[PDB]
Amino acid sequence: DSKPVFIKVPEDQTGLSGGVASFVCQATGEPKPRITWMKKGKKVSSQRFEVIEFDDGAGSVLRIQPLRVQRDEAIYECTATNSLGEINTSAKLSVLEEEQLPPGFPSIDMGPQLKVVEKARTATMLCAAGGNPDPEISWFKDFLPVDPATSNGRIKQLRSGALQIESSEESDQGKYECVATNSAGTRYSAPANLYVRVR
């Protein structure tokens, strides 16, 4: 038995009007903790707001789309609770209009494209991003962060930012978004489908 401990903490994020912003929050604990989201100290609920859980509810993603300048700029609080305790952490979201975009704001030079892969073959989703400084690349699959570290080497992210999936399986099917993040902000690629076809 132990109090919840954050192992993924949402960071401040600067997004683009009409785009997407995801906050990820995860904790460990025994019993397994539950994650709850708040905006301005109130639980979330909108047509533009989606909450996707993972890790049996010990992980959670707040996804906002499309980002709207007026209403989405706010402080979002993540709370992790079990019978032993409660912890929390907040992050600010900023949303820029197109004309407020600094010159080095990340760009999607070449996004991932639709991919049909033979079962047990290796699939590779590409993502070439630009910007100044050089952006960091992460991936979401059906709105959830892809964590290569938990795949036992089967899934890995290349230094080009590409996601390489070996021994493709039924579960690898879904829509993949690549995300480019700078000190200037975050930009999502269009989603691309990965299908697994019978050999």
UniProtKB/Swiss-Prot annotation:
Residues 4-94, 106-195 form the Ig-like C2-type domain. It comes from the Eukaryota. Glycans are attached at N88. It is found in: Membrane. Disulfide bonds join C25-C78, C127-C178. Heparin binds at K39, K40, G41, K42, K43, V44, S45, S46, Q47, R48. Belongs to the protein-tyrosine phosphatase family. Receptor class 2A subfamily. It is linked to Aplasia or hypoplasia of the breasts and/or nipples 2: A group of congenital deformities encompassing total absence of breasts and nipple (amastia), absence of the nipple (athelia), and absence of the mammary gland (amazia). Interacts with GRIP1. Interacts with PPFIA1, PPFIA2 and PPFIA3. Interacts with INSR. Possible cell adhesion receptor. It possesses an intrinsic protein tyrosine phosphatase activity (PTPase) and dephosphorylates EPHA2 regulating its activity. The first PTPase domain has enzymatic activity, while the second one seems to affect the substrate specificity of the first one. This is Receptor-type tyrosine-protein phosphatase F. The gene is PTPRF. The chain holds residues 30 to 228 of 1907 of the full protein.
